[PDB]
Each structure stands twice: as C-alpha cells, then as structure tokens.
Amino acid sequence: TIKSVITQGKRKTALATCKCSESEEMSILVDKVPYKILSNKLMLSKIKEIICVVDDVNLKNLSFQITTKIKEGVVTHKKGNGEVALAYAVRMAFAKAIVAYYGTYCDEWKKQEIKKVLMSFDRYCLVGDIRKKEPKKFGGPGARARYQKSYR
Amino acid sequence: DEIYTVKTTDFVNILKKSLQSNTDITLPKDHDILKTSTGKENCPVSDDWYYARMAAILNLIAKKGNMTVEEACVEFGNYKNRGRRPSMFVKADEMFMKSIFENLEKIGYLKENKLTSNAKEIIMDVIQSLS
C-alpha cells in the first residue's frame, strides 16, 4: 500500500499541512509548484537548510506536497503580507514528516539518529512558538506606548 | 492545471505576441492615452498593455474555477495618496475590463464562466514551448 503520514506545524496565524508519500523521485510541491522555481527566496532557503543538514541519500525516494493557509479575521489588499510567517510554518511541518515516516514504517535506530542532528541544529524546528502581539491598553496608542503629556 | 510548473513572467512574454497577431479584437477609442484607473497617477509607460493584461488574466481563470468581472477589479487595485491624510485602497476600472471580458467571448477563448477547449490547446503549446 501507499504509506502516508500527515503532520501540521503552525505559527502566530499561519498554518501548514504537509503530506508524505512514497515515490521513486524525490519531489517537493508547494501549492503544486516545484520548489526550485519559487520566487520567495526566504521560503526557498529554509527548505534548502534542511535538505543539506541531513543527507539527500537518506531522503532518497519520498514525495512531499504542501498546502498553506492564513486564518480568517483580517483582510489585506497589500502585497507581501504573509511571507516570513508562512515560511517558518512550512519549515516546521516539513521537518515533522521526515521523522514521522522513519518511526512508523522504517527501522527505529535510524530515527533518533537524524533527530539528534536537527535538535543540535535547532530545538525550535519541531515545536511551535509562544510569542504573539501583546494587546493594546487604553490611555495610549500602543501596548507600552503612552500618550505624550505636557504641563507648562 | 500545469500552469504552476512554469513562471508567471515568461508565460506572458511569449503569449502576448500571438494575442496581437490574432487581430480579432476591438479596442477602446483612446486606449493609448489614459489612466488604467483613478487610483493611478499617469498613463502606462509600455506601448502595449491591452494585450499583455489579457495574457495576465488568462493565468487566473486557468488556475481557478470561475472568474467574474468584479473579481478582476480587486486584484489590480491601487494605494494612492489623498493628501496629507494617509492613503486609501481603490479598485480598478470596470469599463476597461468589460471590453477585455467581451473580446475573449467574441473570439471564443472563454464561455459563460469557464474556458473553452480552444484556448486550452493554445496554452498547452506554450508550456512545452518554454520547456
């Protein structure tokens, strides 16, 4: 049968949902686009980070397909809105499916081997962040910014 | 739906020459000297834009399910200054895209909301032409 794992990794408002599947050619698809022709180079460079720290021999014959999302509530007609935030989401969720496939249908002693390498590389590639926008309080324009007062 | 496999700027750069050489389209009377919308400042610097925009709109209807006239104006909006106060978002002009929507139904590349089979075999030459 076709073995498939699906893992999610998310940020402040971004969502990522990869799917691993077994094919003879190593391929990575982001919105049905090959990754080598991506325009957002920051999204390309973070995937280029994980492709080199673990060997391409270990990632020999697998297929990954990646869909993105931004949660509702805000509407933006501007360009360049969700560039960095989505790139950290797909950097997180893609690294999840690698160790996911090696744990279920592969040998278990190889699973913790590459897991130690990336955790020595970055602990926060596999876990989400906590930092968000702090809410605004009254009496000022921002979170900690207070309005300028004057007495004379 | 293999339009994702190629870029966007090269898909327009080849297809716009044949969209000129078809010579089956009507054009507005003063499309050489006008603004594209009220949000824009000046006329475009390119000598041709009525054909290159028609190559650009064929990307979106091919990658999506259905494309109406109102959805076209929102993707080409502008952020213009209103003065000392901060800016505001405007939409594109509904009259220019109306003739653009009319020309492709006058040719026969699209019907009521989807595309025809005739424009599909045109695009399939183009993707193998670049690669």
Add this chain to the structure above:
Amino acid sequence: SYTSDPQELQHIIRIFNTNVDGTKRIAHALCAITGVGKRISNAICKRVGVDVLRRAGDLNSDELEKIQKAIADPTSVGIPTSFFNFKRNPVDGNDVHLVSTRMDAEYRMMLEKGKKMRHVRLCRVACGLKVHGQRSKSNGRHIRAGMVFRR
C-alpha cells in the same frame, strides 16, 4: 557607428514667448509653460508622433510647426474634450484650453466683473480670504490665501 545618442544638441528654445530649454525630454521640458501640465504634455506628443524620449535640443523645425499648431488648435489633432480647462466656459459656451497670455488675461477679467456685482465668494478672492469651508482660528496667520502663481 553609434546612434543611440545624438551628435550635437541645442540649449534654449523660444516657443509661445517662454524660454523652454535644457537637455530634457519633450515630456518634462514642455511642463515649464503654464497651462500645460504633466498629463497633457504626454497627451499632445503622442498625436504628433514624436517620441517622448527625445531631447528637445536636437529637433527639426518642421516638427516644431506641428507643435505650435497643436497647442493652439487642440480640437483638430484629435484630443478628446475632457482634457480642457474651460470645458463649457461661461463667457463663450464651447470647450477651449488656456495658454499663458490669454490665460492670465481671461482670469483677471473674471475677477473684475464680480466687483461690480459684489459677489461675496468672488471678492474674498481678491483680498485673499479662504473662499471654501476652512476655519480661520489658528492657521494661516502671516500668509495670504488668494490665487497664486510662480514668480
């Protein structure tokens, strides 16, 4: 050998009794004259057919005569009437665009007729009060608020 740049140019040109001059493009150098702005300067040259990216120092005198007729007679070359300043003017009733010497002489003549009629919106323009809905409490103290021209 090399033709992307002209051999020699000229500096100062005399057109409609103003000194349009410089090694500027024909779109920017024609913006020196009042009555002609940056929208209408590009709009006239596309009808005459001279390219915008041509410096005005190198130009043929036969091309100059079309320029003198086009600005004088704008309805002949094929300009639509929406580009004019006096669209349906009160003094005449037909569409005409203003050029400097008739432009100032028409504007002040409109100001004199409001003095005899005592038009309260019009006479505040002459002394320099703000005719629109502005509030004059704490703004515009030393300045004047009439009609203003450069130099």
Add this chain to the structure above:
Amino acid sequence: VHIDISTTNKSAITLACEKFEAFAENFIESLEKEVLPKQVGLVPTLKTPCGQGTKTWAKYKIIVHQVRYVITSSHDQLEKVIQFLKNFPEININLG
C-alpha cells in the same frame, strides 16, 4: 428536527443534557449533539459622568451558550419529551 438550547449560565445547560441523553437516545430514536462557540457583546463606555478627571474606560459583556440537537424521528416520539422534559430557566425552541 433541528432543536436548540440557548442559555445564559453554564450550570443550567449541563443538567438538561444527561436528563435528555438518557431519555431520548436509549429509549426510542437516535440523535446528534452539537455545541456552538459563544457570542459576546461589547459596549466600551466611559466611567465618570463628567470630563474632569483621568479618563478611564470599562467593558461590559453578555454571553450566550448554544447547544443544538439534530434529530430525525417519528411524530409523537419527540413531542412527548417536550411536555415531559421542560426545565425551568432554559429556553428550548423546537423546530419540527
């Protein structure tokens, strides 16, 4: 037969559940439970009835809990339960 529960406090909508789940599911027909997220009204208001002191604001609120049942049954099997399981503070508008 879409039937809903709309309340103002949590404790009233809880005791109506285990009374209804034993009586309706185990006896005659099947059902579906569906809880909707809460809806909050916000009236930010200024505190003092004057414009003298330091200007402070207050936010008032009112919360509505929504739990809906989707049942398809025979005619009198649901309507006997309306007369039997009518609880005191809660509203239960039934749409047959």
Add this chain to the structure above:
Amino acid sequence: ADIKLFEKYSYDDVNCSDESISSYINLSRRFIIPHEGSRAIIKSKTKANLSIINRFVNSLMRNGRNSGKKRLANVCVEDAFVIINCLTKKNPLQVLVDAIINAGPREDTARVGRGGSMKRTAVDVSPSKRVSLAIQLLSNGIRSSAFKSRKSLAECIADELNNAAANSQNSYAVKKREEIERIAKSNR
C-alpha cells in the same frame, strides 16, 4: 555537502587574528540567508551566541523611515560582497573580520566630576563592549557617505570595509578611532 554563506562563499577559511576578541566572535551559526527564529537565543543575559552577519544587517535598518525592512537589507549586502570578492580575490568574510578588529577602539576615558574642576580617568574596554562599539561606527560613515550622493548602498559598503581592514586611514571609522585613542592617552 555543507551549509554555505550564499551558496558561493564558505563559513570556513576565515580566522580571527585577535585573541581577546575571538571568544565573542561567532562562527558556529550557519545561514544561507541570515535569519533567526529561536526564542531561546534572543531572551538571554549573554551575548556570546549571536551571529556576526546577523548583527551586521541589524545595523542597516536604522532610521525610523527605514525601520522594519530586512528584505531591502539582504539585497544590498549581496551586491556588496560580490564586488569585494572580485577586486581582492579573497574570501569576503575575511575582510569582514579584519574590519571589526581595526576599527575597534582599545581604551576610553571616563568623566567623573562637575564644573571647572572635573576629574578625567583612563580605563580599559571589555571585549563585549569593543565589538558593540565597532559596529556602530561603521554604519554611520556608510549613512553619511551615501545620504545625498549618487553612490548606491551596495557601492559604499565595499570600499568602506576594504579601507578599514587595510588600515588605509581614508575610511571613516579609522579617523574617529584616531582621536579617541589620543584623548584617553593624554588624559592619563
């Protein structure tokens, strides 16, 4: 296959010649594009584990009209380093570490007192304070030389780091280090 700088240069083949500064000089973090996303590295009392390339681009987005832009910083640093590579036939990272060392001030004075009777005393500088003072000097002469001139931002970065590393004294931060090392000497 190892991580490279821009897939064109290498984090290796560079070395810090100064012994005192080499502890806080970091080379361990490798980035194809210098970007940080860890909460743990940020919230820390210590500043030893911070990438120098990450610290260098943060001195670019300086003024309030220009704050909040890392994309515009990453373009002009790429067009900078390619000119330094071909002109010198060196690793462009190698001229970078020689730029920090030479423009770094050695010792500075401290003013305690008030009025016409004011005591001046000459003290030394910690290596953590020497690095942070050196980066702030270099970005200032860049923003002065490229403010109202036809030099792009990519051009002014290149000849700044070449003149400061070569001790050619026509750069900005070497002239400013000249007087402050003189002031602390005569005050002693």
Add this chain to the structure above:
Amino acid sequence: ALKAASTSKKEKKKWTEIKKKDEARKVFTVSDELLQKVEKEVKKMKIVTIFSLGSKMNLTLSVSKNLLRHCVNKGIISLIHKSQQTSIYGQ
C-alpha cells in the same frame, strides 16, 4: 518668588546662510573621441558600473547607461549581477 522666565517669538526664527553657488554642467552628448576613449578603458577595467565612468569622463548617468549597453552588445564585458537595485558589469 521662585523663578520668572519669559521667552519671545523672535527667538523661534531660523538663521541660515544664503545659498551655495552653482556648479558647472556635465556633458550630455557623445563625441567621436568619446566613443574611442570609453572602449579602450573599459577593457582594462574589471568591474564597471554606472557611477564609475561618469565620475571619470564627467558624463551624466543617463547617457552612461547606453554606453554600458553598447559595450555588452560587443564581446568585451558581461553583466555579472542584476537586481532591482544595482546592476554590475564585469568580465
């Protein structure tokens, strides 16, 4: 009777030097000798850009763009890097 301080509106006016004197003009046209001198010097120079040659031959930058474009139409130098900010001509 602590402190009595008063200021005027005469202090808020700025003082500025009048003007800096005008500079002589650059050249905007190409000569036949200017055609020759750019091609011999560029073949010596490794990395060439727009501001570099106008700072040598006193040329404005608008006419220097075509002099770089005409040179790359010959097999002398080649554009080695291009972005939206700055293009780099090299060998």
Add this chain to the structure above:
Amino acid sequence: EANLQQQFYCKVLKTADRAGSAGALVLVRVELLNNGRKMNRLIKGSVREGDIIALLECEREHR
C-alpha cells in the same frame, strides 16, 4: 596589521564591586599571561570570569 603589535594579554580573576558616577564601571583583579603579576584596574564594559582583556599600557595602577 600594525595595530596588532600593541596588545598585551592578561586574564581576569574575579569581580570585586561596582563603582562609578552612576554605577557604570566595575573593578576587577587581573593577572598577566606573560609573567606572574596581580593588577587592579577599572574597565567600562560588562565582563564575566575567565575573560581575556586587550590593553595598551600595562604599567599604570589603581590606588
């Protein structure tokens, strides 16, 4: 490269206390790596134990 010959190499032992006009300077005990010595001197920036400090003059003293 001529600025590299002026440095002398020395290692801090421990921190004593803070002293300054606003409490911005610190006093430290430092020994030379060339010869066995013990010096007390004020330094501006913040230090931890085990640092190596670059200094021009090695002969001046505190108190």
Add this chain to the structure above:
RNA sequence: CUUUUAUUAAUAGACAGACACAAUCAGUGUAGGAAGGAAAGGAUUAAAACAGGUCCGUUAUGCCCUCAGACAUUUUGGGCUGCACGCGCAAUACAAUAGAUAUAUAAUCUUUAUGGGAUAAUAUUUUGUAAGAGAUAUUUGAACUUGGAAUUGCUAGUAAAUUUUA
C-alpha cells in the same frame, strides 16, 4: 476572565519539581520539557483625607428667583465655526534605503528640486426641506533641503513602520 500544549471539551498539565552553589526563609546557574520562577496580560480592590469635579444626565433634592406675546413651549432665518495675535495634542514632508509604470525583479524612465501638496478656476455628480459639505476630469502649483534654549516615552515579539473592523 483572556491567550498557549494535549485529549474523552471540560479535563489534565507547573510544584521552584531536579542537580549544584556551607545554615532555616531565600536568591542564582545548568538540564529536561508547549510553558521555569507572580506562565503572559487584565479585572476586582482596606481604614483615612481633598471645601478636587459634577445642580447643563435624571419625576434626586433644600433655599432663592420668574407666572401667560410667561425666564414656559412651538415656528422661520442667523450663530456656537468669526480674524491683528500667544499656546497645547496630532497627520503628511524635506527624496536613490526614493518616485512613476508594470507581468510586481518582463522591460524602461527620472540621476537633482519629475521630492511636496497647500490655495484657487472650469466642468460632471452623491446625501439632505435646505451646501463655502463628500466624490471625478484637466490646470494652478506655497513654505519646506533635518529645525534655538528646553523637554516626553521606552528593556521583547518591546520600541519603530505599514495595514485593519465597531
């Protein structure tokens, strides 16, 4: 009470727990963890004081004043917005780390006042019983090239910049 990890969606999960730093109470450093030191941010809130503000919110009120072209109430126009001038809080700017155009890195232009938008004219038009009120086309295009003495806020997703509903 809100956000965060999990899962039967209403329940778990953190305690300074662990090790080290000579005592109790503590404080600091490393390690595991979604979260480590009040987990992050709010809301509620002692005694007591001020001749602090509020009779122009009240069918809350004492005294005083006024009694039918009323010091009541209704209708039509004009005001609260005026113009020599001093002050406080704010929005755009003084430009290549930029502007116009665009396929948003296709390509091209401006290489110093094409930066900047006040003021004003002509023409089409929205709401309203009623426009010196809002919107559109073209033209006119001010000061302004980083600001004297002095002074306000700010320690992490904080300041700063750009967007977004009621």
